Amino acid sequence: SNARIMEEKALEVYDLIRTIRDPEKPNTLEELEVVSESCVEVQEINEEEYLVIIRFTPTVPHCSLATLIGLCLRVKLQRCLPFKHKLEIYISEGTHSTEEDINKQINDKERVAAAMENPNLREIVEQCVL
Amino acid sequence: SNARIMEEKALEVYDLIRTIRDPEKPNTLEELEVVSESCVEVQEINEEEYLVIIRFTPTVPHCSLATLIGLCLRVKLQRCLPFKHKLEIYISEGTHSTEEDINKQINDKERVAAAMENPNLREIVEQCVL
Numbered sequence: 064s065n066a067r068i069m070e071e072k073a074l075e076v077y078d079l080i081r082t083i084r085d086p087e088k089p090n091t092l093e094e095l096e097v098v099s100e101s102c103v104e105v106q107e108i109n110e111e112e113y114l115v116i117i118r119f120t121p122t123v124p125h126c127s128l129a130t131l132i133g134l135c136l137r138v139k140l141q142r143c144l145p146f147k148h149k150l151e152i153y154i155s156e157g158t159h160s161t162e163e164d165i166n167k168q169i170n171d172k173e174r175v176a177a178a179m180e181n182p183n184l185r186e187i188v189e190q191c192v193l
Numbered sequence: 194s195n196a197r198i199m200e201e202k203a204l205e206v207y208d209l210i211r212t213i214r215d216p217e218k219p220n221t222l223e224e225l226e227v228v229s230e231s232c233v234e235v236q237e238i239n240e241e242e243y244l245v246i247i248r249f250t251p252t253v254p255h256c257s258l259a260t261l262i263g264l265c266l267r268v269k270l271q272r273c274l275p276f277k278h279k280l281e282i283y284i285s286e287g288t289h290s291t292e293e294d295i296n297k298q299i300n301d302k303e304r305v306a307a308a309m310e311n312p313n314l315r316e317i318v319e320q321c322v323l
């Protein structure tokens with residue numbers, strides 16, 4: 064059965080993501096209920112290629128947290144998953160950055176440099192400043 | 194006279210940024226009142242080196258819009274301002290990303306790539322997935 068094999072893969076995925084540490088607190092994603100077993104789904108694209116879908120909820124709805132958790136899920140799974148896979152990840156809510164936090168971001172040199180190196184963003188800017 | 198040379202400089206800065214196209218709308222920042230003449234301040238850090246401070250307000254408080262306006266201001270003045278300067282930008286409210294927009298972000302190839310290359314974020318991620 065496709066369906067039961069997909070449930071086996073979802074448990075494998077979950078066993079790898081549960082012990083990822085939160086970007087902010089000294090606890091695991093599982094401990095803080097950012098992820099749980101039911102938040103994973105696996106689908107077949109074609110033999111030898113699976114799509115993994117992970118829903119998660121950061122401890123508070125802040126953009127930088129959501130970004131970082133997304134990065135950790137990809138890094139951990141890319142390194143540790145023993146089958147070829149596409150990954151899609153979804154948060155269940157909008158997020159925000161406080162006045163203080165967004166001003167930090169738009170002035171932080173590392174953050175500015177990374178957006179500048181994004182070819183999609185750099186082209187939008189190119190076209191605004193002409 | 195320091196004070197008045199600073200006003201001259203703030204008018205030169207303003208004249209450059211007011212014609213920047215908004216990232217989302219078919220208008221300039223000045224038309225949309227994202228910036229105005231009094232939102233620019235210039236200070237002396239020392240001879241041949243001025244701090245330029247720009248306050249702005251995006252048409253709506255969304256993170257991507259604030260990020261892109263910030264980039265455009267920086268590139269514009271980098272390319273056109275005929276004096277050595279440091280730039281600080283400030284938005285006077287927090288911002289948010291809808292559930293739709295934050296999901297696009299955490300799945301978008303270039304956004305993930307750029308974040309991974311930001312040294313602060315990559316070191317955090319390393320520690321979280323170790």
Ligand SMILES: [Zn+2]
Pocket residue numbers: 123124125159
């Ligand atoms: Zn908050």
Ligand SMILES: [Zn+2]
Pocket residue numbers: 126127158159160256257288289290
């Ligand atoms: Zn945000």
Ligand SMILES: [Zn+2]
Pocket residue numbers: 253254255289291
């Ligand atoms: Zn909104």
